[PDB]
Design a protein around this ligand. Structure first.
Ligand SMILES: NC(=O)c1ccc[n+]([C@@H]2O[C@H](COP(=O)([O-])OP(=O)(O)OC[C@H]3O[C@@H](n4cnc5c(N)ncnc54)[C@H](OP(=O)(O)O)[C@@H]3O)[C@@H](O)[C@H]2O)c1
Ligand SMILES: Nc1nc(=O)c2nc(CNc3ccc(C(=O)N[C@@H](CCC(=O)O)C(=O)O)cc3)cnc2[nH]1
Ligand code: NA
Ligand code: NA
Ligand code: NA
Length: 181
């Protein structure tokens, strides 16, 4: 019935997310939380889906492709079809979402992005929550998170401490779309 689409992203002080096709940092504890948030489901036997762009797919080491215990959906007009049954190449955002709402064993769609994928999620009726990791500093990024109006959301007020790995500081933020709260 209810099918949420959540956004999860780590942005720096200028909203940057990507550099030279990869991520501008490596935060193992932050990424373990990413893996847990995008994998764990309320209903066991049900799965979560991750929707991503081709460049996010190419940024994952092939030994970790596809992302374990999740149904992978890759948006691309150029990619050949993936024979792996846990991966589907979707030619459009609308067809990807329609396919995911068709499969009943999917509990939550996690938009793991690429700027355009995040942008389409921000305009989706299924938009539910944004899980933003705000990293301190300017990491000289060449790809940025979409310009989002935070006034559309309610910021969750749970206590959020500062984190640090490898001399990199960051804090967690959670937002809920205002029509859902
Ligand atoms: N820090 C973070 O939390 C975070 C989050 C995600 C990614 N990143 C960084 O962001 C960068 C990549 O993100 P990106 O935005 O540059 O590229 P991307 O969006 O990850 O992938 C772009 C590709 O996705 C496909 N695509 C996107 N929208 C589509 C649509 N509506 N219909 C069909 N195909 C579509 C196209 O593939 P074709 O070109 O094959 O058509 C496009 O070239 C990387 O550097 C990555 O490390 C970081
Ligand atoms: N909060 C957040 N952090 C990120 O690093 C992030 N990265 C992307 C895109 N880039 C990547 C890069 C690597 C992996 C990856 O290898 N994930 C594995 C390993 C997690 C772990 O280290 O335990 C996974 O199982 O989730 C995923 C996304 C999208 N949203 C994000 N969101
Ligand atoms: Na497939
Ligand atoms: Na679309
Ligand atoms: Na802009």
């Amino acid at each position: 019935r209810t099918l949420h689409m959540n956004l999860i992203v780590a942005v720096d002080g200028c909203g940057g997310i990507g550099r030279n096709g990869g991520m501008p940092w490596f935060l193992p504890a932050e990424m373990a939380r990413f893996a847990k948030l995008t994998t764990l489901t309320t209903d066991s036997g049900k799965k979560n889906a991750v929707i991503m762009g081709r460049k996010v797919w190419e940024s994952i080491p092939p030994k970790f492709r596809p992302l374990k215990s999740r149904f992978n959906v890759v948006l691309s007009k150029k990619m050949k079809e993936e024979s792996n049954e846990n991966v589907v190449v979707a030619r459009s955002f609308e067809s990807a979402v329609s396919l995911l709402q068709d499969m009943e064993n999917i509990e939550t769609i996690w938009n793991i992005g690429g700027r355009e994928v995040y942008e389409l999620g921000l305009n989706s009726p299924f938009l539910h929550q944004m899980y933003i990791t705000r990293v301190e500093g300017d990491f000289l990024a060449d790809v940025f998170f979409p310009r989002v109006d935070y006034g559309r959301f309610i910021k969750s007020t749970e206590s959020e401490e500062m984190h640090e790995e490898k001399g990199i500081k960051y804090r967690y933020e959670i937002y809920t779309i205002k029509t859902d709260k």
